Amino acid sequence: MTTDDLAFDQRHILHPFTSMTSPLPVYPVVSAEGCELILSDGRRLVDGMSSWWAAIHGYNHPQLNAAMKSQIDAMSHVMFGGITHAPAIELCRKLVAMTPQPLECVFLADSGSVAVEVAMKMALQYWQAKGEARQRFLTFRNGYHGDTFGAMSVCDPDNSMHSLWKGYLPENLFAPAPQSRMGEWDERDMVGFARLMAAHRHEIAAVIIEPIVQGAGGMRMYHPEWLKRIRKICDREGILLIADEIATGFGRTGKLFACEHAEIAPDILCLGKALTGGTMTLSATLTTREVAETISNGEAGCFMHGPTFMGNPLACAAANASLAILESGDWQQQVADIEVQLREQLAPARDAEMVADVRVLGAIGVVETTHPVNMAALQKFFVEQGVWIRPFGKLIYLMPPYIILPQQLQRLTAAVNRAVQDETFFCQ
Amino acid sequence: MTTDDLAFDQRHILHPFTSMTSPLPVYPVVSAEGCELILSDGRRLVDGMSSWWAAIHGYNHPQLNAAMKSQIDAMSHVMFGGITHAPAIELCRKLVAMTPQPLECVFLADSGSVAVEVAMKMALQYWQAKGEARQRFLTFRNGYHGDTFGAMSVCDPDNSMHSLWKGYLPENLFAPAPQSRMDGEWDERDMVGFARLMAAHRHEIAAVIIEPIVQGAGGMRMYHPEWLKRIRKICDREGILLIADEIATGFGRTGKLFACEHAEIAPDILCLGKALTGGTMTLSATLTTREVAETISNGEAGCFMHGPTFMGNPLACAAANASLAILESGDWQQQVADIEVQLREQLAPARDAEMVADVRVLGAIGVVETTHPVNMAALQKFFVEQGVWIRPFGKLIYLMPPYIILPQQLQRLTAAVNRAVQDETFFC
Ligand code: NA
Ligand code: NA
């Protein structure tokens, strides 16, 4: 990559949630291997982010690579309308088997946001078929479910800046963010959620939440008793429960799916990110026979959705290989050890002036700061320390690949602790 | 693939817009090469569909394969937050250069529907930044723009069954479907409906969104280019943004590189997908102007508020680059022109068949509209038996073959279509 390549990127290529008028520096990556990213200048960075949850097995994984190349040799893509193929069948077999018993019907899609849209549409079509006027969703404040319009309608109105779209987005119900920490249960935490359910139980199509960990909305970690109760309340009212595990799925919190922390099963489950081992985009929405059949027996005679690249053989083959790595069970002890090391190594941030809170769960470590980070200065600092850590707002957090070496994880935690010692890298 | 595999697929795997209770047969594909799909059982089928537009270069293309394998060796994926890479830069360079001059800022995404959502959000954020209360979209009937909530809100209300979501979807403006034909003559009576809507709703319209020249999923309609000229001028005069959805028409399918070229106009926002990667895997792009991109970044949010996890996916970008490189030869023009002449000549006899209502051809798109709905299971079996993969829908039996299709292969397709419509056997 030439300097001119970088200049073109700056003036012509949009990046996630960042200004085109006041763009901040981006770092050119040429390749990646193991748990490291390699910059154009040759510098190697220990990846602390897993490219946002997904790369649970790191980069250039020989098994993932071989499975992808082998599927390319057969066919990278063929349409799924009137056609099926081995990669999709193998993936759906695994997904059905590894999730709770009732979840046995799979709708594959391309991205997390679309998977949520699918889940929401399932809930709406389900009630339409039953002849019930139910079009509201009940969710938690500080939640995040994606950027398409349906998903946006259940995201935190504040974090997701709903004022920008006031009048376009449907108005859903937002219960207070769960207070009880992943800590002791306080029954008073339920008063808000209960109030909403009482006033709106008749019109709620589904409850949608991120189980245990609220990611993009604040990297919050709450008590599993919340899920147990929500499941009981939904059962009681006949309301569908949608669990968005696009971030928590596939071992990240210490259990295969975060719903396990409460031994609960949702009616609808959304999966993405780590599904393919972070090699390429793919998502899945699973639901029950009751939901799937009810929908097909309604007026449309089917579930009204079908993306062009649905069931993409290549992505399915990548996901199959990624799931096969997890089948060994090694991730269990890898995450447990990462959790101990995160707890042990981030503890000192509790003595730092710029820190508001420290919390760890599984292979997730979060240092919340008192002031917003200076994105440009702090990103450069991390790069200079030989690590790739991507902060945002008042959060400096780590979600490393499960295969990360202890000395690599240590470089990450040391960098985090050094960043929070004084006001140098803060505000802007 | 065993019969047990096929049973599992039927019981547990949803497919595009089809029942989970009364599913029709799906054919197992094991591989694909050139212009052929290879069924598990060994039968080879000439592909007439390009897996829904996308596979313009066919299957197992050497250049696409090589580019994909090479990228896997470097990195299949890395996050785009704070990072850039060669595949993304090379792809965006190509997209900026090949599209009209004003289109110089690129937002990469995962799927066509997401690209449309991005375009819609760009329009909404644009006006919000300018302090204008514009939230409505003006579109045309028989339009199709994707399956997510925003996209659905601009799809034809009859075809997409908007009654399922009445009360959830925002209510947009729908001008009559364009009547003047691409083969035929311009009738100024065509404009009254659109003019009436614009005059009455000008001040609240954020953007006009249309599929240029060909309305795909909404009826495989082919309308006169004067429409686009007129719309562009009206938008220019009223200060309204024009979104061209070229997710199906892009990259040469209608005889020109982009269908907008037929009217020699450029939109403010351009959506691309399907054939972008040569139909190897999912990827999309939304291009806009500097005026739009900068205005949004100068507003409240300080940026365009979108950023999918797999944004800029290196692997998909490498595939798209290889696909565009093939198109750079200019060869597609002659290929598409030849396909067009053969389609016109060989579908012509179908105009005399009792079961045919209309025959229309444009570029590498050949359509035979019938008087009655086709019998999906029976007609699909017929086509497979003739050694062709043609996927009909409703009253439409259409062809959109890979540009590399041989004349003999194309003849098998047209022969099969003509035979399918000579009597009512495969109808109702
Ligand atoms: Na299951
Ligand atoms: Na351009």
Swiss-Prot record, chain B:
UniProt-reported outcome of changing residue 253 to K: Increases aminotransferase activity toward SAM
Entry-annotated residues carrying N6-(pyridoxal phosphate)lysine: 274
Phenotype of gene-disrupted mutants: Loss of biotin synthesis.
Keyword Transferase belongs to the record: yes
UniProt cofactor(s): pyridoxal 5'-phosphate
Catalysed reactions listed for this entry: (8S)-8-amino-7-oxononanoate + S-adenosyl-L-methionine = S-adenosyl-4-methylsulfanyl-2-oxobutanoate + (7R,8S)-7,8-diammoniononanoate
Residues that, per the record, bind substrate: 52, 144, 274, 307, 391
Cited Gene3D superfamilies: Aspartate Aminotransferase, domain 1, Type I PLP-dependent aspartate aminotransferase-like (Major domain)
Extra remark beyond the main annotation: Catalysis proceeds by a classical ping-pong bi-bi reaction mechanism.
Function of the molecule: Catalyzes the transfer of the alpha-amino group from S-adenosyl-L-methionine (SAM) to 7-keto-8-aminopelargonic acid (KAPA) to form 7,8-diaminopelargonic acid (DAPA). It is the only animotransferase known to utilize SAM as an amino donor. Complements a bioU deletion in Synechocystis PCC 6803.
Family: Belongs to the class-III pyridoxal-phosphate-dependent aminotransferase family. BioA subfamily.
Name of the molecule in the record: Adenosylmethionine-8-amino-7-oxononanoate aminotransferase
Organism the protein comes from: Escherichia coli (strain K12)
Lineage of source species: Bacteria, Pseudomonadati, Pseudomonadota, Gammaproteobacteria, Enterobacterales
